[PDB]
Amino acid sequence: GLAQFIKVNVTLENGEPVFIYTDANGQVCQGDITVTQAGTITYLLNDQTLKGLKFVGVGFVTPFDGIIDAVTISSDGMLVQLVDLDKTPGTTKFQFVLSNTANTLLVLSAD
């Protein structure tokens, strides 16, 4: 199994969140992952917004498609991990879901 690692950097531009993914080499990427065997994807939050962002989960418009088997979250909301057993072939799209300390609205990454 492979364990892949992406950093989720969140900045504000024009007062709103911008999500910039970096890979283990420090390169900006799309945070997309191809899974070619059973493995994990670990996302680490680097919140530079001053809005107190914490992960609360990972959201899917097609949550029963079988592409991702499970989501785990750390107690401090700085990490989410995806389990992908890579049995079902195909593609899924997801949005990070975060709380913030400025208001009671949840924050989503781009569709």
Binding site: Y21, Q30, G31, D32, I33, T34, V35, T36, Q37, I41, I67, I68, L82, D84, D86, K87, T88, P89, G90, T91, T92, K93, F94, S109
Partner: peptide, 7 residues
């Protein structure tokens, strides 16, 4: 982001 499974 998107995940692509190629099993």
């Amino acid at each position: 982001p998107q995940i692509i499974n190629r099993p």
